[PDB]
Amino acid sequence: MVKVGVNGFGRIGRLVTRAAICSGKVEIVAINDPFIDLNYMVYMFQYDSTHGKFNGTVKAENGKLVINGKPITIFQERDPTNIKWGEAGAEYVVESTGVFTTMEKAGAHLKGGAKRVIISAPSADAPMFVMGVNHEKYDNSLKIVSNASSTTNCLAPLAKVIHDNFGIVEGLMTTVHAITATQKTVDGPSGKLWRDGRGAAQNIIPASTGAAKAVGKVIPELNGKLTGMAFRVPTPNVSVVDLTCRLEKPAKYDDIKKVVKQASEGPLKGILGYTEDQVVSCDFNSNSHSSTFDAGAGIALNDNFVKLISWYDNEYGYSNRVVDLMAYMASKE
Amino acid sequence: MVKVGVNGFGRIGRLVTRAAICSGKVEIVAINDPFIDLNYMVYMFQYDSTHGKFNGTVKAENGKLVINGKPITIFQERDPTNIKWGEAGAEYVVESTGVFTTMEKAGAHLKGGAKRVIISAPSADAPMFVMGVNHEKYDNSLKIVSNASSTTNCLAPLAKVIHDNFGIVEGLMTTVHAITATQKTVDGPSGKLWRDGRGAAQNIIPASTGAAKAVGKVIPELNGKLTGMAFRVPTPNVSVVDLTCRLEKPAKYDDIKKVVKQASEGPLKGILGYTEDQVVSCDFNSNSHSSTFDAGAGIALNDNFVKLISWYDNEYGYSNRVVDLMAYMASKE
Amino acid sequence: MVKVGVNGFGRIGRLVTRAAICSGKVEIVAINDPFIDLNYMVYMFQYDSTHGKFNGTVKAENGKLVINGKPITIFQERDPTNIKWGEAGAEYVVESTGVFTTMEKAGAHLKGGAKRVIISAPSADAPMFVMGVNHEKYDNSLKIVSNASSTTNCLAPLAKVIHDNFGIVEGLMTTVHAITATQKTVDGPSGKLWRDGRGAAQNIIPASTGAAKAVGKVIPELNGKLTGMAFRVPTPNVSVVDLTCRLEKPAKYDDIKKVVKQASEGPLKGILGYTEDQVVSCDFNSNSHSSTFDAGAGIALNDNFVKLISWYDNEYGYSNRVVDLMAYMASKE
Amino acid sequence: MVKVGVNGFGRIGRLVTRAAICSGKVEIVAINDPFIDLNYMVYMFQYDSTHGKFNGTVKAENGKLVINGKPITIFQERDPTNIKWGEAGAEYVVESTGVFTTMEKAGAHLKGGAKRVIISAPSADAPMFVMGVNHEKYDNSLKIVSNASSTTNCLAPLAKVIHDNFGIVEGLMTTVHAITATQKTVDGPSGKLWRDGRGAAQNIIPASTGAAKAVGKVIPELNGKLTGMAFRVPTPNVSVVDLTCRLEKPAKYDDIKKVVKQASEGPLKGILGYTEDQVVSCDFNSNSHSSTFDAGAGIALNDNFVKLISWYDNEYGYSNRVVDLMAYMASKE
Numbered sequence A, B, C, D: 001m002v003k004v005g006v007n008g009f010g011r012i013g014r015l016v017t018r019a020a021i022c023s024g025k026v027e028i029v030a031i032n033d034p035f036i037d038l039n040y041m042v043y044m045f046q047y048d049s050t051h052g053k054f055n056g057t058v059k060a061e062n063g064k065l066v067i068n069g070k071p072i073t074i075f076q077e078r079d080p081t082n083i084k085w086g087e088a089g090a091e092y093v094v095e096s097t098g099v100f101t102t103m104e105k106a107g108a109h110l111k112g113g114a115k116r117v118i119i120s121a122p123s124a125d126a127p128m129f130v131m132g133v134n135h136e137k138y139d140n141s142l143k144i145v146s147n148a149s150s151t152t153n154c155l156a157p158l159a160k161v162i163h164d165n166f167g168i169v170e171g172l173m174t175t176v177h178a179i180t181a182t183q184k185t186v187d188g189p190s191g192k193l194w195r196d197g198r199g200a201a202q203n204i205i206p207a208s209t210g211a212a213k214a215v216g217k218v219i220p221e222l223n224g225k226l227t228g229m230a231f232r233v234p235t236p237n238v239s240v241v242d243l244t245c246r247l248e249k250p251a252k253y254d255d256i257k258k259v260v261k262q263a264s265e266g267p268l269k270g271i272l273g274y275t276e277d278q279v280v281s282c283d284f285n286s287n288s289h290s291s292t293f294d295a296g297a298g299i300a301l302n303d304n305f306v307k308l309i310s311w312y313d314n315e316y317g318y319s320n321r322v323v324d325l326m327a328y329m330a331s332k333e
């Protein structure tokens, strides 16, 4: 495969490493995290409150992190410019620290000998891609790219199927979203976004999300036709998209289901899922889909105005898409 | 003031009793609950995990419950027909067990001498009223009435203001709702509502709600123009309405804020609130409003298609509305 | 392998069924639960908020619950005297409803053709057993037995090792315990035990437990030398034992560690575990041990006065021990 | 009343301010925090997820934080030696950042013109005081003091009563402790305390505490006779001390209750509380006691070996003790 270095060994960094090592679709050869040393990396990778103990062996050997017998070079650079990616043989770097989302900042890795960078977040100026939706618009000239956000990877496949078949005239989305590392256990400082500092385990917290507008970038005909917002709620993982949209062509709810179900069995297999079961959020913990349409939870007001519900494991589904994107890029070289 | 019996000393029964006692609009004179004996009522009224210790005295004396020096007759009847309301002097009865919501069942209280019954829940056939929206359409021939649901009591005053000023062509609603007594601590049997049995503290749980349709009964012009659904999430109190609606007349977001703020200061004062602060759900705990508009959390895609956010303490706001409705009804005797 | 019937398809009944299947030690041939119809059992067995989706197939077919292709007979009787266990071939019945814990009540299963009953909880009069501690005291005259509680199955193996090497003069135990089905989502009625009705998601809740005393029954020499209590805290699963005990023979803390480590690799392997990792409760979710010693978490005041810490998955470890006890009983036949 | 400056507007500094204003025992005249603008201070003081909205008026006016009409000078100094306490009239300074807990660091505030410094945390080298237990050991030569920790303030009053009357031969403590600002919302990096980084809302987490050893300095006769540890649990606030101790003189449990009750009504009034009710943790939210003994939750094994339970609001009880300690110091000047 392509040899991958991971910058930022957090929720996404470690679950991208889990998906890479377990799927075998790419090879992790290096990790950088100045806040997690090699022995700490062993513990943080082995144990996971949300996805359970890693099924396999992980150890420290001669200064390397050894996962299922295979060594991984470890870096401790706060400055992404000083990471010697080339010497470790890492061709692609996953930028998952949360603090290098612009091309200028994410371009640091190229200096170390990396050849392309995949920002595990929206970017102000890097080209953004959602597997199943616009990844074929990638081309080899793009050395710095973004895999958008979890919420965008949930909404864009759904919005693609609804728009392709019935036309979205306009839509508004809410995501009811699990807590993340940027939140606080008790009321604490968060100077730019005051509500995000309030106690994550106590509160429903409204928050902004660019995910709906960003869908207008991965689906250009939806530009200006979608926006939305978010609620953070006290669950540790798994989120859900609630898309209220008005349709061009009339659609009985059973045709929406039928069309969404066909897409989940066809080209969006593994990316867009479909279910009619009485599911709840924990039923999608460690599910690798980008988006699972929840037939029974949605509701139509009429044939042109509907509320559609789609679940996503915001940690693990997104991490698998990071791997899929990199594998697609490597196949295009 | 009217004298009141409370049937069902649960979350709503006890909080109706709080709001009545320390606001002097009505007088609780009797309570029936066959699963809470007198001494247990002292303890359950005294302490509240959500709203804090009762501020006042509560004791058991001569077989009655005495709150701030005022004795309350205590019954232990599983069947409402056997409650001697009249002999206790309860003129109105708050039906807050959750299992007598039809006119046939709630009417059992009139056999014990009660004059009128206020069901603390939507009713399949009893007329439904929301303070500030349609309570003046009540008339004195109605011996059995419903105070709708807490979600209807949050959505309807907002919908009234929006529809009065701009016309709601159509709307879809989501309520992100706190846990209630009908849910389960761990995955367990829940009759035919299978999702409602799943662990309340672990899950985001989609659920059905009539509230948006019931708005079409409370605001006739909106009949068939609103529906919606709910997500139960792990908080113990306080919920929020997310109304996505299409407007007939174009409205800038700042014009929406203007009319809502003005309504909150005029005829809907104390029922509909308005805020521009960076609030989260806990900021409405023990808030007696039916609906507080949250200016900053909402978002407009354009001048005719907007997402509006309104907070509600589903426990204490509704319970004050139950008192207000009975005081209003009493004022028309 | 012995054919087993399950009375009460709850947390324990369902995880005993998972454990039976995952381990092959017994064969579930029938299940009784009047509150969970056949199609509903498919769903409750398949989806699990705590332990994840069932790994295998489960379907309803021709009136039977079919798990991994094996059909299981389904009863729907509230009264155990009416379950036709013998018609289904069930020799042992797991009594896991929580309402038939005496020998009189559990004995109803013998009227239906069951040969033995294993009560999934402490019993007032049925003999109680803890795998690895006193299960060899079981003999074939015992047609009704108790597998004690999960807290006893955690405390007793540890207490046995400690007492056999240094002698426990006296000890007091706290278990910090996850929430269970008997608790309430919000402050509600709990007539017998007032604290157990307070909202489980909000509260540290003191609770009684006879578990440490029950160790005096399974380890006779410790009779009257152990008692304890519990705190119910807001987690969905996994609990921890905190044993403060005085020792007759002096022991350095690393003598304690080494003796427990040896026991966990010898005759108590699979029952008592040992770790020095910086674990937290979620690291034992879905762990089959009765009791895992946490070396780093305990602390000694001196060589004779120590506080020892041991983790237990209260759902899954206990369920595996029920299966283990039935399999041991079968080999004695 | 003494005029007080507050360094750090985190939970402690804010709740100390609430306590000071609500009790009128001292006057806040100045606040320093370089990470929080004045308008953010208004918001953070006004809204509190745990203790509810401030009951009073909070606004910014001419660069000052005006609480109930009284203005308060605001500083934004990185370095405490640069804060100008003197010109603000601040005589005592609460050092509530957590990083200036030594006498050398805390003394910096003396360079700004403050007369005394009260560290709101344990100190390596400043004398630690527990109100009600050893505050008689304060003298006017002490310019820098510590109020110890909230757990120390729970345990020491209870230990004193029990050791004064029966003699603690040796004791082992566990505190079951609510979530704090040092924890993480999801599994994240946590320096050398690996367990503290695991998801706070999901886990029961073992932790260290110096509180038991500190009580052996607050009460010198107990030096080397107490040690302990903590479990971090998923609640927002309120903790509980679990003290298992051996008594020199034998005591019936009703003897223990009687002397504790007697101390709570006498010299430890308002510091040590006493209850026999079926309390749970939320019943002590915003309670100003250091320690409330829970008669029904404890258990005696015999007359020389007991487990004693005492509740503390780890946020608000401690904050009120900071104010009382300052008022006590001011009365000795």
Ligand SMILES: NC(=O)c1ccc[n+]([C@@H]2O[C@H](COP(=O)([O-])OP(=O)(O)OC[C@H]3O[C@@H](n4cnc5c(N)ncnc54)[C@H](O)[C@@H]3O)[C@@H](O)[C@H]2O)c1
Residues within 6 Å of the ligand: A007, A008, A009, A010, A011, A012, A013, A032, A033, A034, A035, A036, A077, A078, A079, A080, A096, A097, A098, A099, A120, A121, A148, A149, A150, A180, A181, A314, A315, A318, D187, D188, D189
């Ligand atoms: N639901 C999700 O969790 C999710 C989904 C998609 C995208 N993202 C995005 O992924 C990015 C990281 O998310 P996360 O959830 O994994 O957060 P995280 O905090 O758990 O992990 C970020 C990691 O980066 C490390 N780090 C910090 N600074 C670093 C630096 N200079 N150099 C190297 N490592 C550094 C940190 O120690 C940490 O381990 C963010 O942009 C996030 O918005 C999160």
Ligand SMILES: NC(=O)c1ccc[n+]([C@@H]2O[C@H](COP(=O)([O-])OP(=O)(O)OC[C@H]3O[C@@H](n4cnc5c(N)ncnc54)[C@H](O)[C@@H]3O)[C@@H](O)[C@H]2O)c1
Residues within 6 Å of the ligand: B007, B008, B009, B010, B011, B012, B013, B032, B033, B034, B035, B036, B077, B078, B079, B080, B096, B097, B098, B099, B120, B121, B149, B150, B180, B181, B182, B314, B315, B318, C187, C188, C189
């Ligand atoms: N946020 C809310 O909780 C909320 C808000 C508005 C309306 N409601 C509705 O109010 C009703 C009660 O809800 P709740 O939250 O207070 O639930 P709850 O379980 O806390 O209270 C129900 C009470 O009814 C008692 N009871 C049961 N059967 C009885 C009988 N035959 N006779 C007398 N008493 C009996 C029960 O002991 C219990 O105390 C429901 O219909 C509910 O949907 C709830």
Ligand SMILES: NC(=O)c1ccc[n+]([C@@H]2O[C@H](COP(=O)([O-])OP(=O)(O)OC[C@H]3O[C@@H](n4cnc5c(N)ncnc54)[C@H](O)[C@@H]3O)[C@@H](O)[C@H]2O)c1
Residues within 6 Å of the ligand: B187, B188, B189, C007, C008, C009, C010, C011, C012, C013, C032, C033, C034, C035, C036, C077, C078, C079, C080, C096, C097, C098, C099, C120, C121, C149, C150, C180, C181, C182, C314, C315, C318
């Ligand atoms: N951590 C644990 O949950 C745990 C551990 C060890 C032991 N136990 C004990 O096991 C027993 C059950 O515990 P649980 O957590 O599984 O409770 P649960 O509520 O999850 O399951 C109880 C099941 O019994 C069913 N039931 C009720 N009445 C019945 C009847 N007449 N006939 C047949 N079925 C009936 C119920 O529908 C329910 O599904 C209790 O005694 C408990 O204390 C529980």
Ligand SMILES: COC(=O)CCC(=O)OC
Residues within 6 Å of the ligand: A121, A122, A148, A149, A150, A151, A152, A208, A209, A210, A211, A212, A214, A314
């Ligand atoms: C990063 O993962 C997410 O959940 C996306 C939310 C968001 O960033 O809105 C665009």
Ligand SMILES: COC(=O)CCC(=O)OC
Residues within 6 Å of the ligand: B121, B122, B148, B149, B150, B151, B152, B208, B209, B210, B211, B212, B214, B314
């Ligand atoms: C009682 O208040 C609510 O729970 C609102 C939900 C509802 O009942 O739907 C109409």
Ligand SMILES: COC(=O)CCC(=O)OC
Residues within 6 Å of the ligand: C122, C148, C149, C150, C151, C152, C208, C209, C210, C211, C212, C214, C314
């Ligand atoms: C399974 O539940 C428990 O562990 C505690 C119950 C108890 O009292 O112990 C005998």
